[PDB]
Amino acid sequence: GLVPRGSHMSGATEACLPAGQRKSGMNINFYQYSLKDSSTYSNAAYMAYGYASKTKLGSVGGQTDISIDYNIPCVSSSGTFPCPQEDSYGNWGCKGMGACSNSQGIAYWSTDLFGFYTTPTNVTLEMTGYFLPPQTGSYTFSFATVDDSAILSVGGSIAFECCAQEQPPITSTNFTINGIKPWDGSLPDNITGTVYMYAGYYYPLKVVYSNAVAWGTLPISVELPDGTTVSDNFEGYVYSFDDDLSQSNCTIPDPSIH
Ligand SMILES: OC[C@H]1O[C@H](O[C@H]2[C@@H](O)[C@H](O)[C@@H](CO)O[C@@H]2O)[C@@H](O)[C@@H](O)[C@@H]1O
Ligand SMILES: [Ca+2]
Ligand SMILES: [Ca+2]
Ligand SMILES: [Cl-]
Ligand code: NA
Ligand code: NA
C-alpha cells in the first residue's frame, strides 16, 4: 500500500516534535521524603504524581548520567568513607575499614545525587526529559535493581504531555517499568519494560525514584534495537525543552503514520 497501515488499535506510543531550543540532559526535581517511611512510596498515585504534593527541595538540569548509586558513610578508624552495601557486615563494619561508629538509620547530607546538596537517605526525585531514538525498533528499558522504589514511564500522555516538560506531573499510572516497593516487602515482579520507538521523534521520559533509608540504588539501562545496551550515561539520547504550551503541532499521536 502507498502508506503504512499504522499500529493496530491506535497502539503506537505518543511522541513529540518540540520546535524550541534543545538542551542536553534531563531535569531532576527533588522532593521531601520522610526518613524510614516504608509506606508512602508503595502507592502508585504517590509515585506517578503525589510526590510533587510534598515540599520541593530544589532542582538541577542537564543531567545525562542518570543512575543512582548512593552509599552511606562509614565513620571508621581511618576517617569517613562511603560504604558499598555489599561490603557492609556485622552491626556494623565496612570491609577494609573495620567497625563503623555511625548509625545506618539516620539521615545523611551529601551532594552524591547529581551535585545537589540534600539527604540521599530519604528523598524522592523526578527525572524528566525526552528520549531520542537513533534507530527505529524495540527499546527495552531496565532497572538492574531498585532500592527503595522507582517507576519509569515513556510516552506522551504517560510520562508527561508534549511540549509541557516543566508542568506539574500528570496522573497516568501506566508505567513502563513498575519498580514500586511492594507492601509485602518482596521485589517488584518485573523491572524491565519495552517500547517500540520511531527514529527522530522525541519520546517523553519520566523516572520517579525514592529512598527511605540508608543505601539508594537505581542502575538504569536501555537495550537498543541493534542489541547493544547503554547503561547509566544517556548522553546523546536524552534532552530537555522549555515548555511551549502554544506549539500547536507538538504532539504526534502516532509516529507510525506521521
Ligand atoms: O528495604 C529497607 C532497607 O533495607 C536495608 O536497610 C535495613 C537495615 O540494614 C538498616 O540498618 C535499617 C536502617 O534503619 O533499615 C533497614 O532495616 C537497606 O538495604 C536499605 O537501603 C533499604 O532501604
Ligand atoms: Ca494527553
Ligand atoms: Ca534504601
Ligand atoms: Cl574490615
Ligand atoms: Na552502591
Ligand atoms: Na561518606
Please state the separation of Cα 34 from the chain's center in Å: 19
Cell numbers describing residue 172: 497516568
Kind plus residue range of the DSSP H or E element containing 45 = helix 44-48
CA separation, residue 39 to residues 31, 46, 222 (Å): 16, 10, 29
Q: Which three cell numbers stand for residue 156?
A: 506522551
- Domain co-membership, 58 together with 4: yes
Distance of CA 166 to the CA centre of its chain: 15
Residue 146 and residue 209 in one domain: yes
Half-sphere exposure in the Cβ direction for 41 (13 Å, CA): 30
Q: Rounded CA gap, 27 and 204, in Å?
A: 12
Asked if residue 193 and residue 92 are part of one domain, the reply reads no
CATH of the domain at 88: 6.20.60.20
* Nearest ligand for residue 35 CA: 1
Pocket of ligand 1 (CB under 6 A): 36, 104-105, 147-148, 212-215
Residues 125, 58 share a domain: yes
Same domain membership, residue 184 and residue 84:
no
Cell numbers given for 18: 518540540
- Angle 111-117-122 from CA coordinates, rounded to 5°: 90
42 and 4 co-located in one domain: yes
Residue to mutate (ligand 1; options 37, 86, 213, 218; most atoms within 8 A of CB): 213
Domain count, the chain: 2
Dist. CA 70 → ligand 5 center (Å): 6
Kindly state the DSSP code that residue 80 receives in the 8-state scheme: E
CB 199 within 8 A of CB 133: yes
Same domain membership, residue 196 and residue 98? no
Largest CA distance in the chain: 74
Q: Which of 85, 104, 123 is the last residue of a domain?
A: 104
CB 176 within 8 A of CB 258: no
Q: Are strands 238-240 and 229-231 parallel, antiparallel or unpaired?
A: unpaired
**Three-class secondary structure of residue 216 per DSSP:** strand
**Contact criterion met (CB below 8 Å) for 163 and 245:** yes
Q: Are residues 25 and 100 in the same domain?
A: no
CATH code of the domain containing 124: 2.60.120.1560
C-alpha cell at position 24: 542536553
Taking Cα atoms as reference points, which of 252, 198, 236, 255 lies closest to residue 19? 252
Q: How far apart are the first and last CA of the chain?
A: 16
Closest CA to 200 of 133, 116, 251, 104: 133
**Alpha helices, H only, 101-186:** none
What method was applied to determine this entry?
A: X-ray
Claim to verify: residue 147 and residue 137 sit in the same structural domain:
yes
Do 129 and 27 meet the contact criterion of CB atoms below 8 Å apart? Answer: yes
Which of 194, 224, 219, 225 is closest to 207 using CA atoms?
Answer: 219
Around ion ligand 4, residues with a beta carbon closer than 5 Å are 98
Which of ligand 1's atoms lies nearest the C-alpha of 216? 21
Assess whether 83 and 204 both reside in one domain.
no
Domain that holds residue 94: 71-104
Q: Which three cell numbers stand for residue 11?
A: 497502539
Cell of 58: 530544589
- 34 and 57 Cβ atoms separated by less than 8 Å: no
Q: What is the DSSP string of 61-78?
A: EEE-B--EEE--EEEETT
**63 close to 41: Cβ distance less than 8 angstroms:** no
Dig out the grid coordinates for 131 from the structure: 528520549
Say how far apart CA 117 and CA 80 lie, in whole Å. 18
* Pair (90, 121) in one structural domain: no
| Tally of residues, the chain | 258
Residue nearest (by alpha carbon) to ligand 1 atom 23 = 213
Determine the Cα–Cα distance for residues 99 and 251; give it in Å rounded to an integer.
56
CA 36 to ligand 1: nearest atom: 14
Q: What is the resolution of this structure in A?
A: 1.7
Which residue's entry shows cell 530537555? 240
The residues, any chain, with a CB within 8 Å of residue 161's CB and separated by 6 or more, are 167, 170, 204, 251
The conformation of residue 55, written as its DSSP 8-state character, comes to P
- Beta 93-94 vs 192-197: how paired, if at all? unpaired
Torsion of CA 126, 130, 131, 134, to 10 degrees: -160
Structure-derived torsion over alpha carbons of residues 96, 102, 103, 109, reported in degrees to the nearest 10: -100
Cα 245 to Cα 240: distance, rounded to the nearest angstrom:
15
- Give Cβ neighbours of residue 130 (< 8 Å, ≥ 6 apart): 16, 18, 165, 202, 203, 204, 205, 238, 239, 240, 241
Neighbours of 189 (CB within 10 A): 8
Grid coordinates belonging to 152 = 519509569
Cell matching residue 220: 538504569
Compute the distance from residue 80 Cα to the ligand 6 centre, in Å: 5
Cα(87) to ligand 3 centroid in Å equals 15
66 and 77 share a domain? no
